[PDB]
Design a binder for this molecule. Structure first.
Ligand SMILES: Cc1cc2nc3c(=O)[nH]c(=O)nc-3n(C[C@H](O)[C@H](O)[C@H](O)COP(=O)(O)OP(=O)(O)OC[C@H]3O[C@@H](n4cnc5c(N)ncnc54)[C@H](O)[C@@H]3O)c2cc1C
Length: 449
C-alpha cells in the first residue's frame, strides 16, 4: 500500500463512526486503491467501511445510453459489495449538500474519495470541504502512477511524458491485495424515473425508432473482464497492425468500462504485460492505455482551462489566429453536425457510428473532430461543438481522454506543427483521400448508413 497514491484534501478531527468512501470515478469493487485504502483506515480505527455514491443533477446533460450503462453497473456493484459485508448508499442530489449531510447523519469518522481532475469534481470537492469537520483524503485509483507523482507540470508531448512514466512503473505497477470484508432508494426506481425524464431527448431515427443499439457493450465489472480477456486472446496480436482500420473490430473496446471505472487500467496492464504476443502490438497498446490515457489526466490536472482555446500551445494559438478570417469551405450548424448532414460521407458515417453504438472508432474520431474545426466559424466554436457531441453521445465521454483528445485534434495539444494550410493553419490535417489510402472507406460508410 504505497502512500504516494493518497493525498489529504482537508485535515480535521477524526470522528468515531465509519469510514466513508465517496465513490465517483472508480465504480468497481476489485482492483480499487481508493476502496482498499478506505478499508485499511477503517481497520486501523476499528470501524466499518461504507460506500456512498451520489446520483447528481447533471445526468440530464447526457442521455439514456450513459445513464443505463452506469446504473446497471452499480446494480451489480451493490451485490458485489454486500457479499463483502460493505453497505452501499445511493444519494440523489448535489454532492455538496448530500455528502455533507450523510457524514453528519452517520457520524462518519473519515471521508475518502477517488481522483478525477475534471472541473465538476473540483466543484463538488469545494462544496464538501466547506460542509465537513472530519479528515478528507483522495486516492488516485484510476492511473497506474498517481497523477501528481508522474509529473509536476503539464507535459507538452508524449515523448517528454513517456520516460517519466516508464521510470516509475517498477514502483507503481504491482498486484492488488484482496479486499477484506468488514468484520436512499432502490436503484431500479432511480433508473426508471431518470429514464422517464430523459425520454423526450432520446436520439431517434425519423421512423421514431431509437438510434442507440445497447447490445454492443454489456455494462458491469463482470462484462468488462470478459472484454479484457477476449482482447488479449483474440485481438492483441493484431492490434499493432489494425488499430487504425475502422472496418475491423480490433480495438480493445475497453474505454466505456475504463471511463466509469468498471475495470482498472492497472489490471489491464498487468495482464497484457504477462501475455506473450507480438512485441510491437504490446508496445502500441501499452502506449495508448498508459501514456495517452495518463497524459490526458496530466493535461486536465495542470490546465484549468483544458476545454478552452487558452490551453492550446502558443504555436497553435498563433497559427489558428492567423487563419481566423480565412473563408471556410463550408459552415455547418450544431444540428447539421449532430444529424450527420455534411457533404462528407465519411464524416457522416463516423457520426452515425457514434449515434448508433456510442463508441466511434479511434481513428475516425481524429478525422471527425478535425473536420469540425475546418467547417466551423472559429476554433472556439469548433471546440464547443466537438465537446457537446462527444459528451452527449460517447459512452466514454465526459472524460479527461475526451478533452485531451479533442484538444489534440483541434488545437495540436501533444502534437507538433505541420505544413501550413488555409483555415486550419499548422494543425495536423487529415484528408478524405488520405483515409482512402489507409483503409476501405466504402466499407465503413456502407456499414453506417
Ligand atoms: C476527438 C477525440 C475524442 C475522444 N474522446 C474520448 C473520450 O471521450 N473518452 C475516451 O476514453 N477516449 C476518447 N478519445 C481517445 C480514444 O479515441 C479512445 O480512448 C479510444 O478510441 C477508445 O476505444 P478503445 O478502448 O477500444 O481503444 P484502444 O485503441 O483499445 O485503447 C485502449 C485505451 O487507451 C486509451 N487511449 C487510446 N487512445 C487514446 C487517446 N488518443 N487519448 C487518450 N487515451 C487513449 C484509452 O483509455 C483506451 O480505452 C478521444 C479521441 C479523440 C481524437
Amino acid at each position: 500500500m504505497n502512500p504516494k497514491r493518497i493525498r489529504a484534501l482537508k485535515s480535521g478531527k477524526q470522528g468515531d463512526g465509519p469510514v466513508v468512501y465517496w465513490m465517483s470515478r472508480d465504480q468497481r469493487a476489485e482492483d480499487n486503491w481508493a476502496l482498499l485504502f478506505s478499508r485499511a483506515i477503517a481497520k486501523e480505527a476499528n470501524v466499518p467501511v461504507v460506500v456512498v455514491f451520489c446520483l447528481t443533477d447533471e445526468f440530464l446533460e447526457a442521455g439514456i445510453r450513459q445513464y443505463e450503462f452506469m446504473l446497471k453497473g452499480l446494480q451489480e456493484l451493490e451485490v458485489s459489495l454486500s457479499r463483502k459485508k460493505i453497505p452501499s448508499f445511493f444519494l440523489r442530489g448535489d454532492p455538496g449538500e448530500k455528502i455533507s449531510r450523510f457524514v453528519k447523519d452517520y457520524n462518519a469518522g473519515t471521508l475518502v474519495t477517488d481522483f478525477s481532475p475534471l472541473r465538476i469534481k473540483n466543484q463538488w470537492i469545494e462544496k464538501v470541504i466547506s460542509g465537513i469537520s472530519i479528515p478528507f483524503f483522495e486516492v488516485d485509483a484510476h492511473n497506474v502512477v498517481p497523477c501528481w507523482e508522474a509529473s509536476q507540470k503539464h507535459e507538452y508531448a508524449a515523448h517528454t511524458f513517456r520516460p517519466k512514466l516508464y521510470a516509475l512503473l517498477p514502483e507503481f505497477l504491482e498486484e492488488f491485495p484482496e479486499l477484506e470484508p468488514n468484520s436512499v432508494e432502490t436503484l431500479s426506481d432511480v433508473l426508471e424515473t431518470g429514464v422517464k425524464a430523459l425520454l423526450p431527448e432520446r436520439a431517434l431515427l425519423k421512423n421514431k425508432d431509437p438510434l442507440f443499439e445497447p447490445w454492443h457493450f454489456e455494462p458491469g465489472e463482470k462484462a468488462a473482464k470478459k472484454v479484457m480477456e477476449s482482447f488479449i486472446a483474440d485481438r492483441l496480436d493484431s492490434y499493432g497492425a489494425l488499430r487504425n482500420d475502422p472496418t475491423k473490430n480490433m480495438l480493445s473496446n475497453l474505454s466505456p468500462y475504463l471511463h466509469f471505472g468498471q475495470i482498472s487500467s492497472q489490471r489491464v496492464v498487468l495482464e497484457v504485460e504477462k501475455a506473450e504476443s507480438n512485441p510491437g502490438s504490446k508496445k502500441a497498446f501499452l502506449d495508448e492505455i498508459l501514456i495517452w490515457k495518463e497524459i490526458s489526466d496530466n493535461f486536465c490536472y495542470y490546465n484549468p482551462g483544458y476545454d478552452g482555446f487558452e490551453s492550446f500551445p502558443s504555436w497553435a494559438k498563433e497559427s489558428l489566429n492567423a487563419h481566423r478570417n480565412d473563408v471556410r469551405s463550408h459552415i455547418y450548424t450544431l444540428e447539421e453536425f449532430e444529424a450527420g448532414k455534411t457533404h462528407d460521407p465519411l464524416w457522416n458515417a463516423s457520426q452515425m457510428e457514434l449515434l448508433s453504438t456510442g463508441k466511434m472508432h479511434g481513428y475516425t474520431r481524429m478525422y471527425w473532430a478535425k473536420k469540425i474545426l475546418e467547417w466551423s466559424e472559429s476554433p472556439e466554436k469548433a471546440l464547443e461543438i466537438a465537446i457537446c457531441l462527444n459528451d452527449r453521445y460517447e459512452l466514454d465521454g465526459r472524460d479527461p481522454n475526451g478533452y485531451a483528445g479533442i484538444a489534440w485534434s483541434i488545437g495540436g495539444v501533444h502534437d507538433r506543427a505541420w505544413g501550413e494550410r488555409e483555415v486550419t493553419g499548422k494543425i495536423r490535417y487529415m484528408s478524405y483521400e488520405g483515409c482512402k489510402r489507409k483503409f476501405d472507406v466504402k466499407l465503413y460508410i456502407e456499414k453506417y448508413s
